[PDB]
């Protein structure tokens, strides 16, 4: 539903979402006779929701001690800063309804 | 059963060079092989808000407010040296011949009648109505686009190269011959015959079209300008840069080849609005509206496929258009 | 008995290089080992509708809007310096030899009968006929693809470099001998014999091959160009690249190899319509159609199998084509 819908047009908007960063935890591997609910699609097929910290993946540097890194220093460049700027510009108009939710979410952001 | 092709191209004839500009004094156009070229130099600029501000909000307070916010604009400029009062533009033009033969096709029997349809055109009559039209667009200085207007003594020095020397040299005067009239002369038609023989494979011609616009002491020129884009980049980039080659400004080859193929006075509006470039759906980008509409049956994509497939031949007074934008070429087919 | 090899592949023979460009003055060409290379520049292009529109939306009152916000491309264009009027193009050619020997066979007696079929070919009618055909396609300047059409005086410099110093040289005329005639000379004889003795294996040849196209002054050269994946969609402005080496514009090795092997006049549809490149399913992407179709027996994949499996030898003319696209090398068998 979500892939074809947000591919072209095929959505009445419903409950659709993506589940990243889940890890496989097995309890017997190729000889599973430990616990119950354990058949030949569930051969230790207990997976595990994500719990990563605020620095789970890596981040590239953007201000080294070079010309294009630090010698041209009127940039403030960052990819997370680009994502924060996009998240600001997606709500750059204060409507006549959501001022209660848009009253502490812009300057705080 | 005889239809067109899916892919079908035509490599262009009348290849021009680029327009390397230089500048010197008048009556130094005789020894004009050593002039310093017009450099490309920046300037800073700011102005006030001359925008037509949309009157859903066109208020006096914002007009006063938008002045102490200036316009951070660094642009480029192309002046003469202040010791000089002329503009020299030199480039090289060659023709190739064999306008009917494509560069790609699908149906090999389709080209076997298109090339001999072009050959019935050629064996009927020469290129000697397109010939003096292109020879007039060369003998005046329409390739000087904005440098031509306002100048005093505009001149064209066409040479002709077949080894490391010049066979016969033409000279003209570019403001005597206007932009209305196409009248052959005792000298210009002997260059029309040159390019009409060059479009049939009867010699290798190589026209070196040198211009001389007399414009003023330390005045400014107009080279064509590139496509820079202020993408919200770093350091506040330029809003107008202009096309250069090695330490010299220039006009592009497609613009200086667009000036030559201003041919057709065969458009369904008038004749007194001037000539237009030849292309499919023959239009002017500046003047905004497109002549040769597909409402009329006077497209290129209507004349050529009704002249080849259905063999409904158009007027002799208009076949010059179709052969002219087969000299132009381009990607055809669906 | 003795069926085909299901996976079989040959290497290259007539190994080209990349041809890099420069430009200079005519008759300065003799002392020319230092000319500056024709480099790929960038210019801005703003064109209009020159494309065939189909009226499902293209109204007569619709084209009035499309020519004030046009399509603003950006191309890569190489031209000469405006004080130079030639085109120096230099590549290097080597010929390896041992044509019929495959590189990845399945069977054991298939290749052993194919190798002595090609060896009794060479033992009766040598490599010399294709050798003088490739010698003609080197003798003119067909590898100057568009740099030759509308040119004025082309003279190809060929050297047989066996050491630091050359062995013997060849000066030619790409317009006296032409795009039609395959008939020998008093000097193309020896270069045919050299490519013949290089294809057989009786001496390794290396041929540096320099072309001087008098294209004109400041004119458009045509280096071969690369592909535009995600470069007119990411930033949108650039829509034409060009192939390049270190501060030079260059011709690809595969299309200079393509112009080496426009050999076969033995296509069945005609003979005066120009020889095409030698391929299995001998075909051109210019004209669209395909000669050497398998709706007739005269295709390559039918000829080679009938000449090896069925054991019937085709005509004396058209065994040249079969060993020609053995010399080309490719992926054969059930791919």
Give the DSSP per-residue string, chain A.
-HHHHHHSS-----S-------EEE-SSTTS--SSSS--TT-SS-EEE-----TTSS----S--SSIIIIIS-S----HHHHHHHHHHHTT-S--SSTTTTSSSSSS--
Kindly give, in sequence order, each residue whose CB lies less than 8 Å from that of residue A71, ignoring residues fewer than 6 positions away. Answer: none
- Cα B281 to Cα B283: distance, rounded to the nearest angstrom: 6
Work out whether strand C19-22 and strand B262-264 pair parallel, antiparallel, or are unpaired.
Answer: unpaired
Burial label, B279 (beta-carbon count in 10 A; 0-12, 13-18, 19+)? buried
Q: Which domain holds residue C158?
A: 12-98+127-262
Closest CA to C185 of C148, C152, C143, C139: C139
Residue that is last in its domain, among C227, C262, C297: C262
Distances in Å between the Cα of A43 and the Cα atoms of A22, A23, A25 are 17, 15, 10
Q: Is C69 on the interface with B (CB under 8 A)?
A: no
Which experimental approach was used here? cryo-EM
C-beta separation of B218 from B81 below 8 A: yes
User: CA nearest B232 in A: which residue?
Assistant: A75
- Cα C30 to Cα C20: distance, rounded to the nearest angstrom: 18
- Statement to judge: residues B49 and B186 lie in one domain: yes
C290 forms bridges with which residues in the sheet? Answer: C283
- Statement to judge: residues C273 and C334 lie in one domain: yes
User: CA nearest B111 in C: which residue?
Assistant: C287
DSSP labels, C260-300 = HTB-----SS-SSS---B--TT-B-TTT--BSS-TTSTTSH
- Statement to judge: residues B157 and B222 lie in one domain: yes
- Statement to judge: residues B225 and B249 lie in one domain: yes
Residues 26-55 of A with CB under 8 A from B: none
- Statement to judge: residues C67 and C175 lie in one domain: yes
DSSP letter at C29 equals G
Residue that is last in its domain, among C238, C262, C286: C262
Residue owning tokens 């990607």: B331
Residue B136's H or E segment, with its range, is helix B130-139
C-beta separation of B285 from B279 below 8 A: no
- Cα B274 to Cα B272: distance, rounded to the nearest angstrom: 5
- Statement to judge: residues B119 and B167 lie in one domain: no
Structure tokens at C199: 């294809």
DSSP E strand stretches across C127-263: 154-161, 166-171, 205-213, 244-245, 248-251
Shortest distance between the Cα of B61 and any Cα of chain C, in A, equals 33
DSSP letter at C23 equals -
- Statement to judge: residues B204 and B149 lie in one domain: yes
- Statement to judge: residues B196 and B234 lie in one domain: yes
Residue that is last in its domain, among B204, B232, B262: B262
Backbone angles phi, psi at C321, to 5 degrees: -65, -40
- Cα C132 to Cα B218: distance, rounded to the nearest angstrom: 64
- Cα C318 to Cα C313: distance, rounded to the nearest angstrom: 10
b/e B129-145 (16+ beta carbons within 10 angstroms → b)? bbbbbbbbbbbbbbbbb
Q: Is B332 on the interface with C (CB under 8 A)?
A: yes
- Statement to judge: residues B18 and B153 lie in one domain: yes
Number of domains in chain C: 2
- Statement to judge: residues C289 and C163 lie in one domain: no
- Statement to judge: residues B113 and B147 lie in one domain: no
Considering only CB atoms, which chain A residues are within 8 Å of B235? 72, 74
Residue owning tokens 């270069």: C191
Give the number of A-B residue pairs with CB atoms closer than 8 Å: 5
Kindly give, in sequence order, each residue whose CB lies less than 8 Å from that of residue C133, ignoring residues fewer than 6 positions away. Answer: C182, C263, C320
- Statement to judge: residues C151 and C180 lie in one domain: yes
Resolution of the entry in angstroms: 3.5
Q: Is B241 on the interface with C (CB under 8 A)?
A: no
Closest CA to B281 of B254, B263, B265, B302: B302
């Amino acid at each position: 539903a979500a892939r074809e819908a947000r591919s072209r047009q095929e959505s009445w908007p419903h409950g659709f979402s993506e589940y990243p960063n889940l890890a496989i935890q097995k309890f017997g591997g190729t000889k599973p006779q430990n616990i119950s609910q354990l058949n030949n699609e569930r051969r230790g097929e207990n997976w595990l929701l994500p719990s990563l910290p605020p620095n789970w993946q890596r981040q590239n540097v953007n201000a080294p001690m070079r010309h294009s890194s630090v010698f041209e220093h009127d940039f403030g460049r960052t990819p997370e800063v680009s994502r924060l700027t996009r998240t600001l510009q997606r709500f750059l108009a204060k409507t006549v309804h959501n001022n209660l939710a848009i009253r502490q979410r812009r300057a705080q952001l | 059963i005889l239809s067109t092709a899916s892919v079908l191209a035509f490599e262009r004839k009348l290849d021009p060079s680029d327009a390397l500009m230089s500048a010197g004094a008048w009556a130094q156009r005789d020894a004009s092989q050593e002039w310093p070229a017009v450099t490309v130099r920046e300037k800073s600029v700011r102005g006030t808000i001359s925008n037509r501000l949309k009157t859903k909000d066109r208020d006096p307070a914002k007009l006063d407010a938008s002045i102490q916010s200036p316009n951070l604009q660094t642009v480029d400029v192309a002046n003469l040296p202040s010791d000089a009062d002329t503009l020299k533009v030199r480039f090289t033009l060659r023709v190739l011949g064999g306008a009917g033969t494509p560069s790609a096709c699908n149906d090999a029997a389709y080209r076997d009648k298109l090339l001999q349809t072009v050959a019935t055109y050629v064996n009927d009559q020469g290129f000697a109505e397109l010939a003096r039209r292109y020879a007039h667009n060369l003998a005046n200085a329409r390739f000087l686009w904005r440098n031509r207007v306002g100048a005093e003594a505009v001149e064209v020095r066409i040479n002709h190269i077949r080894q490391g020397e010049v066979a016969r040299a033409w000279r003209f005067d570019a403001l005597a011959i206007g932009l209305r009239d196409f009248k052959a002369d005792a000298e210009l038609d002997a260059l029309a015959e040159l390019i009409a023989s060059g479009l049939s494979g009867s010699g290798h011609v190589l026209l070196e079209v040198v211009a001389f616009a007399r414009i003023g002491d330390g005045q400014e020129v107009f080279p064509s300008q590139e496509l820079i884009l202020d993408k919200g980049d770093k350091k506040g980039q330029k809003s107008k840069t202009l096309y250069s080659v090695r330490d010299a400004a220039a006009i592009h080859s497609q613009k200086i080849g667009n000036a030559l193929r201003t041919i057709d006075t065969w458009y369904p509006d008038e004749d007194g609005l001037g000539p237009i470039a030849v292309e499919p759906y023959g239009s002017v980008t500046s003047q905004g509206k497109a002549y040769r509409q597909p409402k009329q049956k006077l497209d290129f994509y209507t004349l050529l496929d009704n002249w080849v497939l259905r063999d409904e031949a158009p007027a002799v007074e208009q076949q010059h258009y179709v052969i002219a934008n087969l000299i132009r070429g381009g990607v055809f087919g669906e």
